[PDB]
């Protein structure tokens, strides 16, 4: 006995042998019932194979773990083992952008020509570039430029080292530019390529 | 357990001589004193089963020591039993 | 007679100049119980880590006593009964 069914495009076929028509038909019915049971594909039959939980258990379609670019190096012995002080000679926006480009660094901390204040430039994404100052000033006071940039309206706040690390952790930005509470001057912390924080100071 | 002074006085009163501390008479006396103290404790804390097991161990050791004494010298066994107020 | 260390925190409203005499009277019972020895040190008016009984500051007193356990328990009961004592804590300066 052979049976073929077209369940909504899915072909389910079965074949049995028997000593007579009745036994063969009954065995074929049992076989087809088992096949259809294994075919269901509705939610009740596909709910135990869907990946569950967050970290426990792993499956082929389980969501891959989100990994940051930096080595983890958890808060335990994170430390600050990179302190650059590249340049604080005054520069203009275009000169700061060129100093950015060959350094291959997404953000860069310099001191502005017109203001005399510390500033940090970074890639503003599709909007162009973005400039952040210790005290926000308009474009007219800022030295003339030709690159299309925008200025962040918020000021760099005053806060401590541990508070800065906490803000960076809870705010998830690639860096934090701030005026140090104890030092009173500019500082840019970024998570390094080894898991430590890179604190750039004057 | 007992303090040093109680042990000293018990050993002095029941010890065969002024030095012995492991003689079966002295051991039996010390075990009996410990047993009575543990009984007085357990009369208050009925549900302290672990100390009750310790009491059972002490009782068994005292019984074995009395067995040894009665096997070695009957008169010493009678004297010890009558002096410490034990029944069996 | 065992040694004990009692740390008490009192409310800050009452004057500090009366803390040492008043506490003295609180020890009088344990002084008359069994011939006990006391050493009182006071370093008070310190802000607490957390608010205790609607209070932020407190007066800290340390008493080193050598007395019987029953006497120390009775003294602790009296100290807790007093309304001018925010908290008490009794430790044994022995091996324990």
């Amino acid at each position: 006995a052979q049976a073929n069914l077209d369940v909504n495009g899915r072909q389910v076929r079965a074949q049995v042998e028997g000593v007579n028509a009745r036994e063969a038909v009954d065995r074929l019915e049992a076989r087809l019932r088992s096949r259809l049971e294994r075919i269901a594909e509705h939610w009740e039959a596909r709910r135990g194979g869907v990946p569950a939980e967050a970290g426990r258990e792993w499956r082929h379609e389980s969501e891959p773990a989100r990994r940051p670019g930096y080595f983890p190096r958890p808060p335990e012995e994170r430390r600050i083992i990179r302190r650059k002080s590249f340049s604080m000679v005054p520069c203009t926006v275009d000169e700061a952008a060129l100093e950015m480009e060959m350094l291959d660094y997404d953000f860069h901390l310099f001191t502005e020509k017109g203001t005399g204040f510390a500033a940090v430039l970074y890639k503003g994404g599709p909007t162009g570039y973005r400039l952040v100052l210790v005290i926000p000033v308009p474009a007219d006071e800022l030295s003339p430029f030709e690159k299309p940039i925008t200025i962040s309206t918020h000021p760099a706040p005053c806060l401590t080292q541990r508070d800065a690390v906490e803000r960076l952790g809870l705010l998830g930005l690639p860096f934090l530019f701030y005026i140090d509470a104890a030092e009173g001057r500019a500082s840019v912390i970024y998570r390094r390529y080894d898991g430590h924080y890179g604190l750039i100071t004057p | 357990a007992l303090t040093a002074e109680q042990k000293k006085e018990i050993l002095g009163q029941y010890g065969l001589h002024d030095t012995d501390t492991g003689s079966p008479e002295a051991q039996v006396a010390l075990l009996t004193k410990r047993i009575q103290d543990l009984t007085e404790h357990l009369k208050v804390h009925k549900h302290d089963h672990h100390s009750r097991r310790g009491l059972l161990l002490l009782v068994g050791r005292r019984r074995r020591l009395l067995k040894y004494v009665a096997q070695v010298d009957v008169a010493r066994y009678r004297s010890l039993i009558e002096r410490l107020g034990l029944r069996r | 007679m065992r040694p004990y260390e009692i740390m008490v925190i009192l409310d800050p409203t009452l004057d500090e100049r009366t803390v040492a005499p008043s506490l003295e009277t609180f020890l009088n019972v344990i002084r008359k119980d069994g011939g006990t020895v006391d050493k009182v040190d006071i370093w008070g008016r310190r802000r607490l880590a957390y608010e205790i009984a609607k209070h932020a500051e407190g007066i800290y007193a340390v008493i080193d006593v050598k007395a019987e356990p029953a006497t120390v328990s009775e003294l602790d009961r009296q100290l807790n009964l007093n309304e001018s004592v925010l908290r008490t804590k009794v430790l044994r300066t022995d091996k324990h």
Binding site: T153, H154, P157, L159, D163, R167, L170, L171, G172 | - | -
Partner: protein, 115 residues
Amino acid sequence: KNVPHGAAHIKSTFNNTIVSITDPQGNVIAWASSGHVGFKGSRKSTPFAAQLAAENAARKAQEHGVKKVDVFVKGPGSGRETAIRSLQAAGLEVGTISDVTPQPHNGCRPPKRRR
């Protein structure tokens, strides 16, 4: 009223985010929820819904005289990152960030595990 300085309370659960701006004496002055910005069901658990709710709450605090705020995050991470980013992006200055999540000292029995 006019409250130049206030606080921001962000509760980001696994299926909703609630943002409330608060006069520092603890009085809510303007709140926006994930479902209040047009989302419903699982859609309101997304970070984008948290962004919209945070921006709406920021505007509803800004027209009330709030200029500088400090944020108190709370709850398992669903859209906290985007919530604070949107709070900043709507012209509301962020003073400080504090993680105040109710952490029991092993009290109460949690519900039985799902399967």
